[PDB]
């Protein structure tokens, strides 16, 4: 639902009210109908409610920086000048009520109707297209509520009483509508541990195991030893879920979305999240949430703390007056000093204030905020950048409540202005590497079930620290979950687990850690041997559905999105060394790193020299041949260290072992030398792994299928050698596919085919190594490219959406492709006949 | 003020003893008027009857375990809770309860005096154990709402004699909702949906009823005093 | 204070200004006054700083 | 106030927002401020302050006349619905009364924004700092019904609109009030000359001043949509009085309407540390949260973005504007006590209204509020509706039952800015296109439809929405006889049209024809 | 008020939104009494615009000057 | 299976119409034909199967009739 | 237990615009929600007496000032908007005011005629120097809660007649408390104190009265239903 107001609406519905008035007699030509509506007169309010009767609008927010930024609303007629939005999706469109506008567009023709409802409803767009996770899940307000309700105060108000030989149990009650009758007298406290008879809500799974052992059933009562706040919390929940019995951080909620997502349809998921909305905003306004300058509390310990570090401040300018230390060296030390005094002060602050303050509230539900503010406001800023950004040894040891003086006030404004300056470069940066990620793809789309094959890249699942336990992987959720299996699981026993050709998401990592087996097989979109695109099957799941991903469906638009999206929360540049956007646009684009790294050109044992500022490797091979050597090795890049699992290896050492491939040096490979040595598989595996990290280590969750789809757009052609029998000229970069076709096809005299050779290229490169000359004339030279073009008889086969949006025909891909568009539909023999 | 649109009532019935009623259109603001107080009128101002106490023999402390017998005091406790028992004579009544003997146990099983009335007979009350046996007596009266035990005894007269938490009232939920509607072209009107729960001695309809009533009587008790210039319809 | 017209308005302050406010637009009357030798300016310059004010 | 409590971002923003707040049709000053307020009105120039000492002779609201002590009699002349250079009213009146004396460099008169010479941007505005049911969710707010039926938040809003007469070849433009045929009716609010009459209320589309061009035509001025009200002011210069014209003119009108407005939802209003928000819902007073004198609250503010955004100086404002809009007395008996060291002698005590001052960086510290929160005078009924803490319990309008837990209550000074929402809504089905690139003539003036760039464009690829995205590229921008097709069928009822041929193929093609490329679609 | 008071940065004879880098946009040491490190625009104008402090005024040759009380002893 | 009644657009459910079809755009398709069809009829052609409304936009009486199982899509 | 008691309803005096009603006995958690239902009425719908627009001699429109006269029209409309009148007719009326000459204008110097009542004849509206006159025409009508300005376009056809906002409520402030009082405390009772605040133009007890009789007409409606 969306609110609307009339004066828009109308103006938007113009036609369609037009021709109902000139139908119900309200006008009689057309014209003065348009006289009508154009100073509105009081009969065109009346039948607005029957053409907006489920007849969607889309919302668009700028900047639209991925899917979701589009979403169909049916429109609910509210009287005002103000776009009524649904609080849920806010964090989609990336919206808050500060004088934010957004804009509203009216679909026409029944086809794009029907995609409005079935594609872009919001009803239907509750997973993210990058990690599988909900975004309609509940925010701020909504998550006090429910943290407030689903709480246990031990010391409440009608609480169980441990029956003591005088009286029973005195805190029991026989049904969730007596403890409400009670609630409603002073008698019991909504957040009080008590004994309640539950009929409708199902038990968890260890009690429906221990007290029914035939099935619970709907009517069956049993005992729950719990508050009524998580009881009227499970009434918002699926009539089979489990009773829960937990506070609901924001984490859980997450939990409990995702399941009810991964076991029961989507039109339940809104209802549901629609439910804990409307609860967690009754129980927030019931919350006992606000500021008062008596709330925000100030530790007693932190002059203490400020004392103990000035003194070792003034221990160091001694020293600097005795000359033992340096003007520099001098900063350091006074930063890495009131560095710490700042922890000090926040974990007093965190063991200071009660957990029924609102200002440790709103940060422990997850609802917004972190300690770092809590500690500015009653601790201390503590240090601060200068306009270079650099620190400033002098700190603040002030806080907002007490109140910085005028000099801190003053050192404190270099910073803010730093980042309102910056904070259109970074989206500048972010969207330079978005649109490049989409113009090497708009090729990709599925265009196949499945490819028939057996090839696929090994996903590890989990370790053994201990040696007796496995140890679930951190980073499986985007490395195994969502994708398609390729080989049969086996165990030491040669027993199946797994079916091949199977979904694989926590049922099947449950049991595959059973037969103590981490390492499996998987599809992926990097071995997908299709003429054009990749099969849906080594694709896997796509993550909004939850299921198989469709054909037709665009899925490098969504990956290059995916990856766009998050990199404003990227470290960058000063407007490698740092490796954020900077690092992925060394990755994307084949670039030579700065500090490189070289590989072990073959397998087998090192010899280490070093000398002044030097190290020298000579590796000599285990099969007995010739050893190579890496020699200007500067010092600075120290070694490959390797912290081996156990026995704590350290550094790599002489007379120690090098698989192929292996990194001697610290740093970062060359993924030319990678693909030389190892292959492209291994570089296309080599670029996902870094880029991967790169995201991990700054909290972005991206499945690695969208770096794998760009990645193979990024080795997907070969520099021809020696000809052969083809129509084909050496020198030239010819399309893997094309080639292998061509070079198969010719079996007459098939006794010296064409010859090529792999070569890894830039998402800009590749952008412009493409087979079309519709897009390349778009892009670039237009008269050349014509020329070349004419002179070889090119075919643009239309394979890409940007030559169908230039000639303005529909685009290769959902309700586009020819599977779609010539369906044809016939009512039933039966159901016609009953005229 | 002749007021506009008259508002209307109607009714939903979802079960037995369940029930959705709707009063449409209101005035703007009159939904959460009369919403709660409706809902309290229903929860706490319908007299009606229910157990105030029970005397077991063979515990007179550790209330824990019942002899011969396989469920506790407490679930009997609250199976007793949800005894559904009319009466007419406003007083403390006794009634008794005995089932010598192994088997089940239902309010059936149950033998009342004059007036006292129970609707729901086979309420199941305990499951007795091979060679055992059940003696308890049954206090029953009158009231309105939900009343808490009641311990206000200085010194124990009646040893054994637990108290339990009373519901006096023949509903036992209630919810209302307040939504939006238009009535020719202006929304932000007020439509009033109430949702109600009761016990089967009455229905759902003729709690209402009895509520609208009693509020009447006190509104009423209010207008009394100029009965002048207000709102008809 | 030092406005005839002074709506009593309680201060919290704990120190006393030793310097009035000055006039907060001077920076722009002042010197469109250097750009016609206004006799306010002049003297304003006689009064401090050099002999003949052009 | 309180600037030290605040963080620069959100202090450059309240700076930057005090900047943009329209002038109110009652102007209230704050009660907490600065010493700052007073010598920005004067210095600015917007009031009118007495040239010499002397004693009020006559006062209107139009003309000041004061006869001073040396003997001369000075007449000061006073801005009535002046219109600025963004529509505002720059209206002035008095704040003397004749017989009074007043020294030189005394404030005559206030200004758009001053009440007795000193800054009035906003208005003290009482309170609660809580979460209400969901409609102050991600810093929206909530407010009362008084300020639209007090209108208190009301702003004036004037507006210029002009029409030249000029001469053309084919003949002269000459303003009058005949014109082909139209309604007799719409002359009704045209004088003798075509132009419209003063007090005339006026709506879209509507004529103002009447002009033509010959053939004849009708080329008079109309209201454009959406602006309305009540024709203030005409201003008319002609060749012939010989005032001034430029050339190719020889006749020229404007008029001055102006337009009351009322708080409405969609508004923008903030505070004076960098908290604004637009107006989610209006709620009458009878289901706000009141205090246990009766006394609604006017506006409630969430509690989840103060502590996240280090503006917090806005808490110890809407407590002092409490200690302020209800006195205080410190019992010093026993001696003044240990948090009143510092204070002067004359804040141990005050009456209501009482303002006050909090320079930046010298100003109210934290003992001192806490201290003051206390004494705070007892209300009408002998009752202190608040805590030491700056917390009220409250009582809910719906439900008539109090939260559980005591709110912070106080009052806050807030403003109301320029980003209204008349003049910020749009919309548009079909109307003036380009004609130098057939699409719309992008524009809130233009009347023209909103923009579908690229990243739009990528989202819809991605949704695999296909007919859609071709309705927005083909059959709503560039396309002629398409737009008209669909038009057509929608107001007679008939199923859209599919695509033909694509018609930026269809003229293409027939450019690389042109280049002798034989260019060629197969199957 | 602050129309009036007001600093640019850019116009015949400044800089331009090329130049016009980051370092010219950020806060100095030197606006202590000379201009305020808070009063800005929010967007592309950031630390170019601002506004002159109240206690300072302006060299005849066109250097902000800003009062010290002085001290001896 | 346990949810409440869909209202409006959200009427029928949705994880149903995709057991009728093999993909979400199929479905689009496979409606859209349908409400021409309709639109057609009631401009000029089996009509409606299912009970219509008062307007009952011709969508979502397509949408009814596949919930129905009264209509057959063959893939191009 | 059960209870036999019904509630009975006493008055008390705190001034002449002001009242306090007391409710007793009650079921315990009954008497907020019953307060601030009547709560609710009195502060929403009571019916009363407003002016509805205004006329003056020489000016046209609320943006224009008065020759000797120190307020601008806007500011003797938002000092009228503080005036309280009793029409006691389902009917519009029209007031008349004539002043000249120095002095203030104030509400006492108004002719209302009979059936009205002007119930705060020191109110300021305007004063005036040698040189004023002031001539206004006012008129009253009946009605509930507030109602903006009908504009004149959309009334009848006019010019110089000024519409204003209208606000017919007699009810200033309205509270309600509830003392916990027990008969013994044997079983939980509750006591509602209800204050009441009227502008003069009618007492509580009317007003009350009012509320009652809206609560009646509006609970018959479950009442009926059987
Ligand atoms: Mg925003
Ligand atoms: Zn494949």
């Known amino acids: 639902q969306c609110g609307l107001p009339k004066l828009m609406a109308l103006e938007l519905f113009k036609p369609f009210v037009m021709k109902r008035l000139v139908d119900l007699?309200?006008?009689?030509?057309?014209?003065?109908?348009?006289?009508?509506?154009?100073?509105?007169?009081?009969?065109?309010?009346?039948?607005?409610?029957?053409?907006?009767?489920?007849?969607?609008?889309?919302?668009?927010?700028?900047?639209?920086?991925?899917?979701?930024?589009?979403?169909?609303?049916?429109?609910?007629?509210?009287?005002?000048?103000?776009?009524?939005?649904?609080?849920?999706?806010?964090?989609?469109?990336?919206?808050?009520?500060?004088?934010?506008?957004?804009?509203?567009?009216?679909?026409?023709?029944?086809?794009?109707?029907?995609?409005?409802?079935?594609?872009?409803?919001?009803?239907?767009?509750?997973?993210?297209?990058?990690?599988?996770?909900?975004?309609?899940?509940?925010?701020?307000?909504?998550?006090?509520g429910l943290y407030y309700l689903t709480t246990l105060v031990e010391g409440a108000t009608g609480e169980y009483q441990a029956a003591t030989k005088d009286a029973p149990?005195?805190?029991?009650?026989?049904?969730?509508?007596?403890?409400?009758?009670?609630?409603?007298?002073?008698?019991?406290?909504?957040?009080?541990?008590?004994?309640?008879?539950?009929?409708?809500?199902?038990?968890?799974?260890?009690?429906?195991?221990?007290?029914?052992?035939?099935?619970?059933?709907?009517?069956?009562?049993?005992?729950?030893?719990?508050?009524?706040?998580?009881?009227?919390?499970?009434?918002?929940?699926?009539?089979?879920?489990?009773?829960?019995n937990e506070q609901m951080h924001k984490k859980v909620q997450a939990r409990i979305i995702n399941d009810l997502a991964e076991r029961f349809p989507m039109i339940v998921v809104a209802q549901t999240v629609d439910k804990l909305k409307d609860a967690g905003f009754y129980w927030a306004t019931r919350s006992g949430v606000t500021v008062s300058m008596a709330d925000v509390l100030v530790p007693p310990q932190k002059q203490e703390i400020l004392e103990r570090h000035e003194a070792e401040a003034d221990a160091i300018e001694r020293k600097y007056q005795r000359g033992a230390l340096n003007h520099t060296e001098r900063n350091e030390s006074l930063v890495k000093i009131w560095q710490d005094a700042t922890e000090e002060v926040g974990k007093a602050l965190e063991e200071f204030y009660p957990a029924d303050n609102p200002i440790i509230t709103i940060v422990k539900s997850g609802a917004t905020g972190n300690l770092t503010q809590t500690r500015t406001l009653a601790g201390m800023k503590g240090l601060v950048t200068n306009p270079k950004g650099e620190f400033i040894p002098r700190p603040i040891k002030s806080s907002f409540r007490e109140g910085l003086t005028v000099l801190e006030y003053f050192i404190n404004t270099h910073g803010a202005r730093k980042g309102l300056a910056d904070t259109a470069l970074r989206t500048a940066d972010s969207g330079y590497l978005t649109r490049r990620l989409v113009d090497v793809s708009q090729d990709v789309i599925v265009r196949?079930?499945?490819?028939?094959?057996?090839?696929?890249?090994?996903?590890?699942?989990?370790?053994?620290?201990?040696?007796?336990?496995?140890?679930?992987?951190?980073?499986?959720?985007?490395?195994?979950?969502?994708?398609?299996?390729?080989?049969?699981?086996?165990?030491?026993?040669?027993?199946?687990?797994?079916?091949?050709?199977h979904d694989l998401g926590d049922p099947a990592i449950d049991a595959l850690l059973a037969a103590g087996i981490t390492t499996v097989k998987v599809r992926s979109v990097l071995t997908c041997t299709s003429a054009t695109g990749v099969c849906?099957?080594?694709?896997?799941?796509?993550?909004?559905?939850?299921?198989?991903?469709?054909?037709?469906?665009?899925?490098?638009?969504?990956?290059?999105?995916?990856?766009?999206?998050?990199?404003?929360?990227?470290?960058?540049?000063?407007?490698?060394?740092?490796?954020?956007?900077?690092?992925?646009?060394?990755?994307?684009?084949?670039?030579?790193?700065?500090?490189?790294?070289?590989?072990?050109?073959?397998?087998?044992?090192?010899?280490?020299?070093?000398?002044?500022?030097?190290?020298?490797?000579?590796?000599?091979?285990?099969?007995?041949?010739?050893?190579?050597?890496?020699?200007?090795?500067?010092?600075?890049?120290?070694?490959?260290?390797?912290?081996?699992?156990?026995?704590?290896?350290?550094?790599?050492?002489?007379?120690?072992?090098?698989?192929?491939?292996?990194?001697?040096?610290?740093?970062?490979?060359?993924?030319?030398?990678?693909?030389?040595?190892?292959?492209?598989?291994?570089?296309?595996?080599?670029?996902?792994?870094?880029?991967?990290?790169?995201?991990?280590?700054?909290?972005?969750?991206?499945?690695?299928?969208?770096?794998?789809?760009?990645?193979?757009?990024?080795?997907?052609?070969?520099?021809?050698?020696?000809?052969?029998?083809?129509?084909?000229?050496?020198?030239?970069?010819?399309?893997?596919?094309?080639?292998?076709?061509?070079?198969?096809?010719?079996?007459?005299?098939?006794?010296?085919?064409?010859?090529?050779?792999?070569?890894?290229?830039?998402?800009?490169?590749?952008?412009?190594?493409?087979?079309?000359?519709?897009?390349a004339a778009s892009f670039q030279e237009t008269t050349r490219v014509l020329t070349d073009a004419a002179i070889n008889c090119r075919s643009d086969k239309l394979n890409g959406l940007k030559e169908n949006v230039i000639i303005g025909k529909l685009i290769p891909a959902g309700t586009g492709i020819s599977r779609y568009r010539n369906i044809q539909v016939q009512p039933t023999e039966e159901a016609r006949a009953a005229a | 003020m002749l007021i506009s649109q008259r508002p209307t009532l109607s009714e939903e019935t979802v079960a037995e003893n369940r029930s959705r009623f709707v009063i449409e259109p209101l005035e703007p603001g009159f939904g959460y008027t009369l919403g709660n107080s409706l809902r309290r009128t229903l929860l706490s101002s319908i007299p009606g009857a229910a157990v105030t106490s029970i005397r077991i023999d063979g515990v007179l402390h550790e209330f824990t375990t019942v002899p011969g017998v396989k469920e506790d005091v407490t679930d009997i406790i609250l199976n007793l809770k949800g005894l559904v028992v009319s009466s007419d004579d406003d007083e403390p009544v006794t009634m008794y309860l005995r089932k010598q003997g192994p088997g089940v146990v239902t309010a059936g099983d149950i033998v009342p005096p004059a007036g006292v009335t129970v609707h729901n007979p086979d309420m199941h009350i305990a499951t007795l154990n091979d060679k055992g046996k059940l003696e308890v007596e049954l206090v029953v009266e009158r009231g309105r709402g939900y009343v808490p035990a009641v311990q206000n005894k200085a010194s124990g007269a009646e040893i054994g004699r637990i108290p339990v938490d009373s519901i006096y009232s023949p509903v036992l939920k209630v919810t209302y909702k307040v939504e939006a509607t238009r009535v020719e072209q202006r929304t932000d009107f007020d439509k009033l949906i109430i949702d109600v729960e009761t016990k089967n001695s009455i229905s759902p309809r003729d709690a209402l009823a009895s509520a609208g009533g009693t509020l009447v009587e006190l509104f009423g008790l209010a207008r009394e005093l100029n009965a002048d210039s207000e709102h008809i319809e | 204070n030092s406005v005839p017209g002074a709506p009593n308005r309680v201060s919290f302050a704990k120190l006393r200004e030793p310097l009035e406010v000055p006039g907060l637009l001077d920076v722009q009357t002042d010197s469109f006054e250097w750009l016609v030798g206004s006799d306010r300016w002049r003297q304003a310059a006689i009064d401090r700083g050099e002999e003949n004010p052009v | 106030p309180?600037?030290?409590?605040?963080?620069?971002?959100?202090?450059?923003?309240?700076?930057?927002?005090?900047?943009?707040?329209?002038?109110?049709?009652?102007?209230?000053?704050?009660?907490?401020?600065?010493?700052?307020?007073?010598?920005?009105?004067?210095?600015?120039?917007?009031?009118?302050?007495?040239?010499?000492?002397?004693?009020?002779?006559?006062?209107?609201?139009?003309?000041?006349?004061?006869?001073?002590?040396?003997?001369?009699?000075?007449?000061?002349?006073?801005?009535?619905?002046?219109?600025?250079?963004?529509?505002?009213?720059?209206?002035?009146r008095p704040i003397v009364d004749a017989g009074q004396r007043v020294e030189a460099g005394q404030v005559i008169a206030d200004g758009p924004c001053t009440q007795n010479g000193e800054m009035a941007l906003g208005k003290n505005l009482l309170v609660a700092i809580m979460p209400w049911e969901g409609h102050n969710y991600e810093d929206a707010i909530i407010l009362s019904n008084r300020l639209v039926e007090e209108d208190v938040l009301t702003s004036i809003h004037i507006e210029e609109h002009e029409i030249d007469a000029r001469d053309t070849k084919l003949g002269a433009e000459e303003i009058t009030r005949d014109i082909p045929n139209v309604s007799d009716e719409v002359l009704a609010d045209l004088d003798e000359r075509g132009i419209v009459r003063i007090g005339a209320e006026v709506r879209d589309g509507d004529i103002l001043?009447?002009?033509?061009?010959?053939?004849?035509?009708?080329?008079?001025?109309?209201?454009?949509?959406?602006?309305?009200?009540?024709?203030?002011?005409?201003?008319?210069?002609?060749?012939?009085?010989?005032?001034?014209?430029?050339?190719?003119?020889?006749?020229?009108?404007?008029?001055?309407?102006?337009?009351?407005?009322?708080?409405?939802?969609?508004?923008?209003?903030?505070?004076?540390?960098?908290?604004?928000?637009?107006?989610?819902?209006?709620?009458?007073?009878?289901?706000?949260?009141?205090?246990?004198?009766?006394?609604?609250?006017?506006?409630?503010?969430?509690?989840?973005?103060?502590?996240?955004?280090?503006?917090?100086?806005?808490?110890?404002?809407?407590?002092?504007?409490?200690?302020?809009?209800?006195?205080?007395?410190?019992?010093?008996?026993?001696?003044?006590?240990?948090?009143?060291?510092?204070?002067?002698?004359?804040?141990?005590?005050?009456?209501?209204?009482?303002?006050?001052?909090?320079?930046?960086?010298?100003?109210?510290?934290?003992?001192?509020?806490?201290?003051?929160?206390?004494?705070?005078?007892?209300?009408?009924?002998?009752?202190?509706?608040?805590?030491?803490?700056?917390?009220?319990?409250?009582?809910?309008?719906?439900?008539?039952?109090?939260?559980?837990?005591?709110?912070?209550?106080?009052?806050?000074?807030?403003?109301?800015?320029?980003?209204?929402?008349?003049?910020?809504?749009?919309?548009?089905?079909?109307?003036?296109?380009?004609?130098?690139?057939?699409?719309?003539?992008?524009?809130?003036?233009?009347?023209?439809?909103?923009?579908?760039?690229?990243?739009?464009?990528?989202?819809?690829?991605?949704?695999?929405?296909?007919?859609?995205?071709?309705?927005?590229?083909?059959?709503?921008?560039?396309?002629?006889?398409?737009?008209?097709?669909?038009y057509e069928a929608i107001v007679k009822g008939e199923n859209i049209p599919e695509p033909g041929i694509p018609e930026s193929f269809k003229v293409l093609l027939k450019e690389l024809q042109s280049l002798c490329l034989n260019v060629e679609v197969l199957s | 008020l602050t129309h009036k008071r007001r600093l640019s940065a850019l116009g015949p004879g400044g800089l331009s939104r090329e130049r016009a880098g980051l370092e010219v946009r950020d806060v100095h040491p030197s606006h202590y009494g000379r201009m305020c490190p808070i009063e800005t625009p929010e967007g592309p104008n950031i630390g170019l615009i601002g506004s002159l402090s109240v206690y300072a005024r302006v060299n005849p040759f066109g250097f902000i000057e800003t009062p010290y009380r002085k001290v001896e002893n | 299976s346990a949810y409440d009644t869909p209202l409006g657009i959200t009427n029928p459910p949705i994880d149903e119409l995709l057991s009728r079809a093999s993909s979400k755009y199929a479905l689009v398709i496979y409606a859209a034909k349908r409400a021409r069809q309709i639109n057609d009829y009631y401009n000029q052609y089996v009509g409606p199967l299912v009970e219509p409304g008062l307007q009952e936009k011709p969508l979502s009486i397509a949408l009814r009739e596949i919930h129905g199982d009264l209509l057959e899509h063959t893939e191009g």
């Open chain 1, 536 to 775: 849906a099957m080594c694709y896997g799941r796509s993550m909004a559905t939850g299921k198989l991903v469709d054909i037709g469906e665009a899925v490098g638009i969504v990956a290059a999105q995916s990856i766009g999206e998050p990199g404003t929360q990227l470290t960058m540049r000063t407007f490698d060394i740092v490796g954020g956007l900077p690092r992925v646009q060394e990755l994307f684009e084949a670039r030579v790193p700065r500090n490189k790294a070289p590989i072990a050109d073959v397998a087998g044992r090192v010899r280490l020299e070093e000398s002044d500022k030097f190290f020298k490797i000579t590796i000599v091979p285990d099969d007995g041949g010739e050893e190579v050597v890496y020699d200007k090795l500067s010092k600075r890049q120290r070694l490959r260290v390797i912290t081996h699992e156990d026995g704590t290896e350290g550094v790599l050492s002489d007379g120690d072992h090098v698989e192929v491939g292996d990194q001697l040096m610290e740093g970062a490979a060359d993924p030319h030398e990678v693909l030389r040595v190892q292959g492209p598989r291994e570089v296309q595996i080599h670029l996902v792994k870094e880029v991967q990290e790169v995201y991990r280590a700054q909290g972005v969750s991206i499945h690695d299928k969208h770096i794998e789809v760009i990645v193979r757009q990024m080795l997907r052609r070969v520099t021809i050698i020696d000809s052969g029998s083809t129509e084909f000229l050496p020198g030239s970069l010819t399309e893997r596919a094309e080639f292998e076709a061509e070079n198969r096809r010719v079996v007459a005299e098939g006794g010296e085919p064409a010859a090529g050779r792999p070569v890894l290229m830039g998402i800009t490169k590749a952008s412009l190594a493409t087979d079309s000359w519709l897009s």
């Open chain 4, 2 to 92: 309180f600037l030290e409590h605040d963080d620069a971002n959100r202090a450059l923003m309240g700076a930057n927002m005090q900047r943009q707040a329209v002038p109110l049709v009652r102007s209230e000053a704050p009660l907490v401020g600065t010493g700052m307020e007073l010598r920005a009105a004067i210095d600015a120039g917007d009031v009118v302050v007495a040239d010499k000492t002397g004693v009020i002779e006559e006062v209107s609201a139009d003309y000041i006349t004061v006869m001073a002590d040396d003997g001369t009699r000075q007449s000061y002349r006073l801005r009535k619905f002046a219109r600025s250079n963004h529509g505002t009213c720059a209206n002035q």
């Open chain 4, 209 to 486: 001043v009447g002009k033509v061009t010959p053939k004849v035509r009708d080329t008079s001025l109309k209201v454009p949509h959406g602006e309305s009200g009540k024709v203030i002011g005409i201003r008319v210069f002609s060749r012939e009085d010989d005032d001034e014209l430029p050339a190719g003119v020889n006749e020229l009108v404007r008029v001055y309407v102006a337009q009351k407005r009322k708080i409405s939802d969609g508004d923008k209003l903030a505070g004076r540390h960098g908290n604004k928000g637009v107006i989610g819902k209006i709620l009458p007073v009878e289901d706000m949260p009141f205090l246990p004198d009766g006394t609604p609250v006017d506006i409630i503010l969430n509690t989840h973005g103060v502590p996240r955004r280090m503006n917090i100086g806005q808490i110890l404002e809407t407590h002092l504007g409490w200690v302020a809009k209800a006195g205080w007395n410190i019992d010093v008996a026993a001696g003044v006590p240990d948090w009143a060291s510092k204070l002067p002698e004359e804040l141990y005590s005050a009456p209501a209204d009482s303002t006050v001052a909090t320079p930046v960086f010298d100003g109210a510290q934290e003992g001192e509020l806490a201290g003051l929160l206390g004494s705070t005078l007892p209300n009408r009924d002998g009752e202190v509706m608040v805590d030491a803490d700056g917390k009220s319990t409250l009582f809910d309008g719906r439900s008539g039952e109090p939260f559980p837990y005591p709110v912070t209550v106080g009052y806050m000074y807030i403003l109301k800015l320029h980003h209204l929402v008349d003049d910020k809504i749009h919309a548009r089905s079909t109307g003036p296109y380009s004609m130098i690139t057939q699409q719309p003539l992008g524009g809130k003036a233009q009347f023209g439809g909103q923009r579908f760039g690229e990243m739009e464009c990528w989202a819809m690829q991605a949704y695999g929405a296909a007919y859609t995205l071709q309705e927005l590229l083909t059959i709503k921008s560039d396309d002629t006889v398409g737009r008209v097709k669909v």
């Open chain 1, 169 to 244: 149990e005195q805190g029991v009650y026989s049904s969730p509508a007596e403890a409400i009758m009670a609630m409603d007298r002073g008698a019991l406290s909504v957040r009080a541990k008590i004994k309640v008879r539950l009929t409708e809500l199902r038990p968890p799974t260890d009690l429906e195991a221990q007290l029914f052992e035939n099935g619970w059933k709907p009517g069956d009562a049993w005992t729950a030893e719990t508050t009524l706040g998580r009881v009227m919390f499970n009434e918002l929940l699926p009539k089979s879920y489990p009773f829960v």
């Open chain 1, 25 to 144: 007699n309200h006008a009689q030509n057309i014209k003065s109908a348009k006289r009508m509506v154009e100073r509105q007169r009081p009969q065109v309010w009346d039948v607005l409610e029957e053409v907006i009767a489920e007849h969607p609008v889309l919302l668009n927010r700028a900047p639209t920086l991925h899917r979701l930024g589009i979403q169909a609303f049916e429109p609910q007629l509210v009287e005002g000048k103000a776009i009524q939005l649904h609080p849920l999706v806010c964090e989609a469109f990336n919206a808050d009520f500060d004088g934010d506008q957004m804009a509203v567009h009216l679909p026409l023709s029944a086809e794009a109707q029907a995609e409005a409802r079935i594609l872009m409803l919001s009803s239907n767009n509750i997973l993210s297209p990058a990690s599988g996770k909900p975004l309609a899940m509940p925010r701020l307000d909504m998550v006090t």
């Open chain 1, 448 to 501: 196949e079930h499945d490819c028939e094959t057996e090839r696929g890249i090994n996903v590890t699942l989990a370790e053994r620290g201990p040696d007796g336990t496995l140890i679930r992987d951190a980073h499986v959720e985007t490395s195994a979950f969502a994708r398609t299996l390729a080989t049969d699981a086996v165990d030491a026993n040669g027993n199946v687990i797994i079916e091949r050709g």
